[PDB]
């Protein structure tokens, strides 16, 4: 039987980048050739595995990490890249062994008047380990003054709002970015092609 992938890509509301939707795919056959042959995505870069020979190989489990970012941070989703989102929201490890898919969705994730439904994390006290989610809303303390949860001087909120609008450029348009991760641990293979 086919692995559930259509409703992942055709989901009505993708999750934000600070809390990305994580799904486990196992005990089925997943044909990644459908995604490549459709070619409905601007980004099909896959480090750690060849863009074509992943289909016939058999893996154990698949992780799908879906989120929405703007245009110019699609480059930031890569091993070794740093940024206010690529480090504070989702840090892809240097030994990434999967693929990342990004496509433009300006007709479904934006509307007139300013779409603020998608958020992002801006300030953090330190870095984050790979495959880690941070939903902490505790006020980032910049200086020595402890504000104790009151917004003010040397205290700014980590989570801001995006700027998704349908009349913007391709560099600030909402792009739906999913991350596929293959684990090759000491487990029998459950997903093939």
């Amino acid at each position: 039987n086919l692995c559930p992938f259509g409703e992942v890509f055709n989901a009505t509301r993708f999750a934000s980048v600070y809390a990305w939707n994580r799904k486990r795919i196992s005990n089925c056959v997943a044909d990644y050739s459908v995604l490549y042959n459709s070619a409905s995505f601007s980004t099909f870069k896959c480090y750690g595995v060849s863009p074509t020979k992943l289909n016939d190989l058999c893996f154990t489990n698949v992780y799908a990490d879906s989120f929405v970012i703007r245009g110019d941070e699609v480059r930031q989703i890569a091993p070794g890249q740093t940024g206010k989102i690529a480090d504070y929201n989702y840090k892809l490890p240097d030994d990434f062994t999967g693929c990342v898919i990004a496509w433009n969705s300006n007709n479904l994730d934006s509307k007139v008047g300013g779409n603020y439904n998608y958020l992002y994390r801006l300030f953090r006290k330190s870095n984050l380990k790979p495959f880690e989610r941070d939903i902490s809303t505790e006020i980032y303390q910049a200086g020595s003054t402890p504000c104790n949860g009151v917004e003010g001087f040397n205290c700014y909120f980590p989570l801001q709002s995006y700027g998704f609008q349908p009349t913007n450029g391709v560099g600030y348009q909402p792009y739906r970015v999913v991350v596929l991760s293959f684990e090759l641990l000491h487990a029998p293979a459950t997903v093939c092609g």
Partner: antibody
Amino acid sequence: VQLVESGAEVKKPGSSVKVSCKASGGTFSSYAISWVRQAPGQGLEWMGGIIPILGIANYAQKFQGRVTITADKSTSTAYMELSSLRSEDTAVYYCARENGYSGYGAAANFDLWGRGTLVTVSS
Amino acid sequence: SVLTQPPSVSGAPGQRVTISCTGSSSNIGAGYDVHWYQQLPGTAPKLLIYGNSNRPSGVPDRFSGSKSGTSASLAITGLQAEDEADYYCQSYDSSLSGSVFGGGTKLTVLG
């Protein structure tokens, strides 16, 4: 802190309610505020939540347009709007706090809970 | 809901009764923490176990949580009179795109 909710009122088919919440001693900030109802004997599920400082809300799939949730940070309160009241909408509503974290999982957990507003629909 | 719990569990005073939450692969098997909630009868619910293994302040040491694979477990080492409650497991889901609770487990101490 403690969260104060309104009393119990009866309602009619159609119409709307204005369930509110109030946090004693302030502290209605840097924390998401979610609303969870307790159905009479069939469990609990999550209506939605707002990050009150940013003023942006999120909802579930079965309650995306039927329910509207608003916040007001000046008086440390949140106003719940529930239009289209039927018979299965009779339940008790709670305003719960959120405690986000960086743990790998990082799942939303409700630390503090309100008193509970019982809303019932009768003809 | 998607998260499945036993409808009720029998209570043996002074022994261990394990409450399980066998969810799907997109909520528990994905990696989200399974937060255990306990509600006293005629009382507002409160956070019993958070972080999937860690205990909030004001929570007795008898209640401990553990999740392996796509199933979670609540350990109750000691069974006293005030443990009469319904236990819910809460986890974030990707397909549902929101936090969902369980079906409840009525821990009924004998008498």
